[PDB]
Ligand binder design. Structure first.
Ligand SMILES: C=CC[N@H+](Cc1ccccc1C(=O)NCc1ccc(OC)cc1)Cc1ccc2c(c1C(=O)O)OC[C@H](CCC(=O)O)O2
Ligand SMILES: C=CC[N@H+](Cc1ccccc1C(=O)NCc1ccc(OC)cc1)Cc1ccc2c(c1C(=O)O)OC[C@H](CCC(=O)O)O2
Lengths: 149, 149
C-alpha cells in the first residue's frame, strides 16, 4: 500500500498531462508532454521513483503496459509494473473525478501563466496542499514514515 | 529545519544541472536546463514546492536571489527566499562534495542513456536511495513526518 502508484493520462489544449497518483494518499506528480509515448512515460517513472519509494505502478493503458521502454525503466528503478484494470469499479470513478478536479484548478490559475506546464505545476501544488483535516502531502509522508518505522 | 532547502547549480557537457538539496536529510531533486535563468529557476522551485513542504530556499547565487521571476515564484509557492551565504564555512564543502559525488554517479551511468537528463535522473535515484544505515529518502520522510506529528 505505501508503495503503490497509479498512472493517469488526461488531455488539455491539444497536449497531454501525465499524472502519477499515490493511491493511499491521493498525492500527485504531473507533467505536460506533447504526446504519451513509451519514452515519455519511462522518463516520468524514472523521475518519480528517484523521488518517492515506488514499489508498484498500475499503468494507465495497454500501450504503456506493453512498452519495452516502460518495462526497461521499471526494471531500472526497481518498480513492479502492473496493469490498471479497475477490478474495483470505484477506481475509474476516482480517476475521472481527479481529472475533473485538476482541470478545474488549471482553469482557476490558467491566466497566471503563459504556458500550460506552469499552470499544471500550480495545479499540482494546490491539489497536494489542499486540506480535505490533512492534505495529500501530509498523508503521503505519514503513510511512508509509518511504513519505514 | 524540516522545510529548509538549498539551491545548487553545477555544469556538465556544456549544460547546467540545477539541484535542490533538503539540508537536514541530503535528499535531492535535480533537472538539466540549457542555462540558469530566473525563469528556469522559478519553474524548478514551483515544481519542488508542489512536491515537498518547502518553507525556505537558500538561493545558489545573487542573480537568482535578485531575480523578480524567482521572487514571484517564491511568493506564489509560499517560500521564504533567502541568500546562500555560507555563514558556516562547512556549507561550501558539503555542496562541493555533493557536486563531485553527483558527477561521479553520472559517469557510472552515463553509457546507459543517450541524453544527459536521463543520466541525471538515474543519479538522483541512486543518491536518494543510497544507504549510509538510512537513505536520504528515508531521512526526509522521517524528518517531515516528525514535524507534522
Ligand atoms: C529507447 C529509449 C531511449 N534510450 C535508449 C538508450 C540509449 C542509449 C543508451 C542506452 C539506452 C537504453 O535503452 N538504456 C536503458 C534505459 C531504458 C529506459 C529508460 O527509461 C528512463 C532509461 C534507460 C533510454 C532513454 C529512455 C527514455 C528517455 C531518454 C533515454 C535516453 O537515451 O536518454 O532520454 C530522455 C527521454 C525524455 C522523455 C522523452 O523525450 O520522451 O526519456
Ligand atoms: C517572466 C515569467 C514568465 N511568466 C510570466 C507570466 C505570463 C503570463 C501570465 C502571467 C505571468 C506571470 O508573471 N505570472 C506569475 C508567475 C511568476 C513566476 C512563476 O514562476 C513559476 C510563475 C508565475 C510566468 C512563467 C514563469 C516561469 C515559467 C513559465 C512561465 C509562464 O508564463 O508560463 O513557463 C514555463 C517556464 C519553464 C522554464 C523555462 O522554460 O525557463 O517557466
Amino acid at each position: 500500500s505505501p508503495g503503490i502508484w497509479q498512472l493517469d493520462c488526461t488531455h488539455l489544449e491539444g497536449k497531454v498531462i501525465l499524472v502519477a497518483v499515490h493511491v493511499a494518499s491521493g498525492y500527485i506528480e504531473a507533467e505536460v508532454i506533447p504526446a504519451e509515448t513509451g519514452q515519455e512515460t519511462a522518463y516520468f517513472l524514472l523521475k518519480l521513483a528517484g523521488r518517492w519509494p515506488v514499489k508498484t505502478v498500475h499503468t494507465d493503458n495497454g500501450s504503456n503496459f506493453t512498452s519495452t521502454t516502460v518495462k526497461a525503466a521499471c526494471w531500472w528503478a526497481g518498480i513492479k509494473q502492473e496493469d490498471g484494470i479497475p477490478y474495483n469499479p470505484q477506481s475509474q470513478g476516482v480517476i475521472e473525478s481527479m481529472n475533473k478536479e485538476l482541470k478545474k484548478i488549471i482553469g482557476q490559475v490558467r491566466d497566471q501563466a503563459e504556458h500550460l506546464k506552469t499552470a499544471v505545476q500550480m495545479a499540482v501544488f494546490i491539489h497536494n496542499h489542499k486540506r480535505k483535516g490533512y492534505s495529500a502531502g501530509e498523508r503521503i509522508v505519514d503513510i511512508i514514515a509509518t511504513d519505514i518505522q
